[PDB]
Amino acid sequence: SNATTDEHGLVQFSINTTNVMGTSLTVRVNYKDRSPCYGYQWVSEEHEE
Amino acid sequence: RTITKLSFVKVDSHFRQGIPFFGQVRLVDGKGVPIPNKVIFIRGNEANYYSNATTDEHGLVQFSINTTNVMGTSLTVRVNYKDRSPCYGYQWVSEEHEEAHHTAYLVFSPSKSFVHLEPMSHELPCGHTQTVQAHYILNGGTLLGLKKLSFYYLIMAKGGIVRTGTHGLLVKQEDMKGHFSISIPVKSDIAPVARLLIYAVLPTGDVIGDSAKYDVENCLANKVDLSFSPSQSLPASHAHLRVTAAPQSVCALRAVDQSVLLMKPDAELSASSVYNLLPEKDLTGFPGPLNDQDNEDCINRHNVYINGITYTPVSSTNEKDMYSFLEDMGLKAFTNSKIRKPKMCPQLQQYETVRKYFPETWIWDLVVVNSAGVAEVGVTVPDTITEWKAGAFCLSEDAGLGISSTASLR
Amino acid sequence: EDCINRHNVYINGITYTPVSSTNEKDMYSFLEDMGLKAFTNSKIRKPKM
Amino acid sequence: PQYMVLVPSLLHTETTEKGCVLLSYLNETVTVSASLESVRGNRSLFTDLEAENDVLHCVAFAVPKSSSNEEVMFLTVQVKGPTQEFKKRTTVMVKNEDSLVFVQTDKSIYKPGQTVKFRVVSMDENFHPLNELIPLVYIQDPKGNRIAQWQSFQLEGGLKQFSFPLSSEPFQGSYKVVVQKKSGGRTEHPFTVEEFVLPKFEVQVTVPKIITILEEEMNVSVCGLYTYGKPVPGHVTVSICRKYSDASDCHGEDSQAFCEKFSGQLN
Amino acid sequence: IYVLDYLNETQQLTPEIKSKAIGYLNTGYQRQLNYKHYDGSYSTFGERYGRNQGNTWLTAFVLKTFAQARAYIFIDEAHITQALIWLSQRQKDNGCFRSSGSLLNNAIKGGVEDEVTLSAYITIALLEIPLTVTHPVVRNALFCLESAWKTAQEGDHGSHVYTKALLAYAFALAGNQDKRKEVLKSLNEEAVKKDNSVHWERPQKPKAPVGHFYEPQAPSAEVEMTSYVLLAYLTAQPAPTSEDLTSATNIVKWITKQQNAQGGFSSTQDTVVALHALSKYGAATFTRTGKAAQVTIQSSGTFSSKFQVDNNNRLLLQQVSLPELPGEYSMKVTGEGCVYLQTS
């Protein structure tokens, strides 16, 4: 689901668990990589995971 | 090295869960001397239908198991002790009895029904048949079903099909049995492994079959055999070998001694010879340069993904489903339905004594039979003290191949 | 020690899972996350083989 | 949408291969063609079958030998739906059916000093005769050479017989004969040629190939007759020996752990 | 093997690189057999791993290059036989099969893993048929190809270049003339051409989120697809139009500009198929004795130009300009061998 910030940034998102047992969740405004300047050894910013 | 070499008589090639197959095993040992009725301990394992018995005089005995098990059913019997107990620490040491180590795997029936068929896998009366018998079922009785279903019985003939024959009968909505009437004749025009097949012509889209086969031993389309003037002494030149086949058929006069053939008997010289001298008889399923395929379906979600009662990556199985039961006879086909199991595409995370007699020729020539049977004169080679034969052979398109296999004149 | 240990789970169905363990939460685990302990003979401790 | 076309994938060109397609539970209409329309569609074995319910009508579209090895001519199969094209990929297996042949013989073993006489056969998928020529055939001498030959012979009733000589001293032993077809199907049969003597003595033991651990009495049964009807009133012994242990014969005696002597007068 | 043909086709070769390439070929062939299957098939590992099943795209490549490698030197027929029939049995009832995923490398196959363009790889690689036969396997590849085309063209998006361009060259070496034409003509509409050339591109801002380094999980397959875009046009068993040759040297200007100083391109697939496209572009336009292409312009303002092109004046650029505001300069070309001109 796509969502946004409330005044607190809260999101009352609900996922129906009609699935299976072993999960692995995730939450981002960005992707699975430090989108600018990740693999450089000299750039030191990050998006919180 | 081993003692007491047991058998597997008529055991299941494979089996299914909704019906008890009967195991059968025999024995031979030493002088050919299984005891009539020495007891065994019939290893019911993981189905746990341990049910001791003993042989008959033949070695044979019949025995089954209970029903309620996963595919992984392991089955066997022992007759004597298990491990290598006596004087066994030297590494120049071994002493064994035979293992009745049988396994199999299980129908993948999300179709949930099947048919359970019984054998011919032994000697055979030809130009015959028998009331063929299997065990049918149906599931949820029938969920909605019909009044009837068609059961038209496929027979993989000569790498394809030859005959036509139908069956089918009522459906009772909510009660099952295991009886079914059918029979098929044994003639010719057939790859000599008898591959029967039968299934439900299902509306919900699935088929039920398997390797469920029979035998086709030596029996012929065109017959021919002989009759001769008798075994007689030195001067009995004027003799006969009257031989009888179809009306119009070129045929042979190979009247012969048989001692120099007792040296090397009819090794590749028979009707089963001319059967199996064919090439490429039944190249089945996945031949030499032949393989399975990547069905575009996939059960891929990004994790291990088994529900129910367990953490388990998709439980790597090894058993038998129905797309391979399309392979196990030899044919292709086309089918929109669901016949193959759900194996997935892997995810990103997990991926001699020389015994000869004199050589001179006696009889070798060809005649053609008539509507009444020719009576050709065999002519004697005296000074020849032995047993004799005529390895003839006949052939024609009005009757097909034929052979006078066996006869004797001393 | 209470155990239902078959040689394998006996799932006659899609697959032949052998003795196939898990990590689902327990009320044993509710109580030890809580922290304290209790005594019964009911079904709380999952039937770990 | 129920339909199933049992298509046997094994081939015997221009000879019987019957075929039928399955349907039940009547839909709009199904008249599928298990076709062989090519990449351009020029060559095909288009024997379409209609599909009606709860019956089967089997048909034998027997098909040719195509190019060098068996070509099916670019196979395609279209499901014939009136308001549907549910259709994807699958092929057939491919080989050329020669007319199938063999040999029988008087013997293989032969005495140099006389001649030879021999016959040949050819049939099809089915087991009925066939009158069609050959390219060639020739008796083989063992030295990579050919000794007899009758080139491009043809059958009479599906058969033929010759009779060829044999010199009274050829190379000894197996002497091959092979027929090869205009595809080159090689069908091979020897005739042994050896001047082994008529040995003027015979003695033939019976003895366990299989004597095993716990046994009570072995009755080694021995009578061979030098002419099958003439034994001696005499005596025989025999080296029943416990043996089979690789020996340098350092003992001066062979590898026997035992050599037993249950000799008796021949009755 | 493709560069062997490419060097030989140009005619600036040497029998020494040739003979040491015989050595290359024998050794490399044999070491392919180090990793194949006991049945005929081909995986990455093979021997000492008896129980296994080969790879699909892999084996498509191996049959292709077995075709062309026999096409240069001796092979044994049983290999192509058993492998062609491997892909032939890779066939249950209907479906367009997918990768039996056992790769060690997602980039060696420049594609994007859809059975669409996989299957299209099968049909081309199994129709290009140099001097052997391609019997059963390849037409039902055309059949699934038409099926996926129906799924796509009934839609409007399959990356808009990649799948339908593979349809183009698949139908082309098939010769589905109206059908190849329809799909390559949609491609011609879906134009991403260059200021001096032509080329095609997947969305480049892809609808799914992308990664960081070289856009991983996606080879980007431009020189392979754009070659497979380039490849549809040159195909016709007598000849295509000269429009095909125009767009070909356009997209091949793009090819050679997209190459880098080492050799090949950013994969093996793109390199193979680029070099072969280029080679048979040549095999069309190149013949030994055909070195006689004569020329004229014919403009009515007494201002035209005669030229000639041969095997040994074979490639001098003739930088030539014009005084008239408009260009009304009527070409003419006679003789033997094709030429590339570029006006602006």
Ligand SMILES: *[C@@H]1O[C@H](CO)[C@@H](O[C@@H]2O[C@H](CO)[C@@H](O[C@@H]3O[C@H](CO[C@H]4O[C@H](CO)[C@@H](O)[C@H](O)[C@@H]4O)[C@@H](O)[C@H](O)[C@@H]3O)[C@H](O)[C@H]2NC(C)=O)[C@H](O)[C@H]1NC(C)=O
């Ligand atoms: C195959 O396995 C089956 C299951 O184990 C066997 O079935 C058993 O068959 C027997 C005989 O019909 C049944 O009757 C039992 O017999 C035993 C015999 O015990 C003897 O020795 C005791 C010593 O104290 C003596 O008291 C008895 O009188 C007997 O002389 C009895 O001990 C039992 O109480 C009972 O009467 C069994 O019910 C049955 N199961 C058992 C317990 O094994 C079957 O016999 C096996 N196949 C063969 C070789 O027959």
Ligand SMILES: *[C@@H]1O[C@H](CO)[C@@H](O[C@@H]2O[C@H](CO)[C@@H](O[C@@H]3O[C@H](CO)[C@@H](O)[C@H](O)[C@@H]3O)[C@H](O)[C@H]2NC(C)=O)[C@H](O)[C@H]1NC(C)=O
């Ligand atoms: C293992 O084999 C046995 C047969 O020896 C199977 O047991 C049989 O199961 C059926 C169906 O439940 C029984 O029929 C009915 O049983 C109920 C029991 O209350 C009875 O009230 C009905 O009148 C009817 O008889 C049948 O009796 C039973 N065998 C016997 C004792 O004759 C069993 O199904 C097989 N495997 C398993 C565990 O399913």
Ligand SMILES: *[C@@H]1O[C@H](CO)[C@@H](O[C@@H]2O[C@H](CO)[C@@H](O[C@@H]3O[C@H](CO)[C@@H](O)[C@H](O)[C@@H]3O)[C@H](O)[C@H]2NC(C)=O)[C@H](O)[C@H]1NC(C)=O
């Ligand atoms: C690659 O190398 C070959 C080296 O042989 C180049 O020459 C080609 O060789 C063949 C040999 O047969 C030529 O065939 C010719 O056919 C004519 C007419 O039958 C005959 O008179 C000649 O004696 C000769 O046999 C062929 O024309 C020639 N070029 C080809 C094959 O197009 C070849 O040019 C190089 N190019 C390739 C094939 O990539």
Ligand SMILES: *[C@@H]1O[C@H](CO)[C@@H](O)[C@H](O)[C@H]1NC(C)=O
């Ligand atoms: C999950 O599916 C259910 C079905 O009723 C739906 O009500 C729910 O909104 C979905 N997800 C949630 C919990 O928002």
Ligand SMILES: *[C@@H]1O[C@H](CO)[C@@H](O)[C@H](O)[C@H]1NC(C)=O
């Ligand atoms: C029967 O099958 C056809 C072909 O898929 C399908 O279009 C149709 O909806 C089905 N039902 C009937 C009764 O036509």
Ligand SMILES: *[C@@H]1O[C@H](CO)[C@@H](O)[C@H](O)[C@H]1NC(C)=O
């Ligand atoms: C198909 O190919 C054959 C090859 O001889 C050709 O004669 C024929 O004209 C082609 N198609 C037809 C039937 O026109």
